[PDB]
Design a protein around this nucleic acid. Structure first.
Ligand SMILES: [Mg+2]
Ligand SMILES: [Mg+2]
Ligand SMILES: [Mg+2]
Ligand SMILES: [Mg+2]
Ligand SMILES: [Mg+2]
Ligand SMILES: [Mg+2]
Ligand SMILES: [Mg+2]
Ligand SMILES: [Mg+2]
Ligand SMILES: [Mg+2]
Ligand SMILES: [Mg+2]
Ligand SMILES: [Mg+2]
Ligand SMILES: [Mg+2]
Ligand SMILES: [Mg+2]
Ligand SMILES: [Mg+2]
Ligand SMILES: [Mg+2]
Ligand SMILES: [Mg+2]
Ligand SMILES: [Mg+2]
Ligand SMILES: [Mg+2]
Ligand SMILES: [Mg+2]
Ligand SMILES: [Mg+2]
Ligand SMILES: [Mg+2]
Ligand SMILES: [Mg+2]
Ligand SMILES: [Mg+2]
Length: 63
RNA sequence: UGCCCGGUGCCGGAAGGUCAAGGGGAGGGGUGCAAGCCCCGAACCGAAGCCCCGGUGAACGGCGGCCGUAACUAUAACGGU
């Protein structure tokens, strides 16, 4: 239910009463998009850098 | 109680430009036999105002546009002009 109320002349009011329909239909019609997710790139270098130094100095003791 | 003094206003500026009456008369003219009488008149000097230089917003006022860009969507902290 749409009401186009502001012009003196009706056929302008219809021009606007209509397009409030059509452009409203488009908004509720087209919805977001593809795609997700991205996956991690440098976990090969980065985290096996941290498993490098971790294993080495781990052969120590104590605390 | 923020930013903008280009514009308008007001305030300041003993320089410069313009600028009226008036001063000044180079030079020209009417007339008379002539002394002369009469009229134009350049340079130049000659206010305020305006120009020009600045100040000023609790003075009048004014406080943008397009385009791109992030863990794919969105959006754009970031950029470009
Ligand atoms: Mg996504
Ligand atoms: Mg250790
Ligand atoms: Mg202990
Ligand atoms: Mg203010
Ligand atoms: Mg600001
Ligand atoms: Mg600024
Ligand atoms: Mg101003
Ligand atoms: Mg001003
Ligand atoms: Mg000024
Ligand atoms: Mg200035
Ligand atoms: Mg002025
Ligand atoms: Mg003044
Ligand atoms: Mg001087
Ligand atoms: Mg002067
Ligand atoms: Mg004179
Ligand atoms: Mg005289
Ligand atoms: Mg003569
Ligand atoms: Mg004669
Ligand atoms: Mg004179
Ligand atoms: Mg003078
Ligand atoms: Mg003056
Ligand atoms: Mg203005
Ligand atoms: Mg994206």
């Amino acid at each position: 239910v749409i009401k186009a109320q502001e012009y003196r002349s009706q056929e302008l009011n219809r021009e606007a009463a209509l397009a409030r329909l059509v452009a409203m239909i488009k908004e509720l019609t087209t919805e977001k998009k593809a795609r997700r997710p991205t996956r991690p790139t440098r976990a090969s270098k980065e985290r096996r850098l941290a498993s490098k130094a971790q294993k080495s100095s781990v052969k120590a003791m104590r605390g």
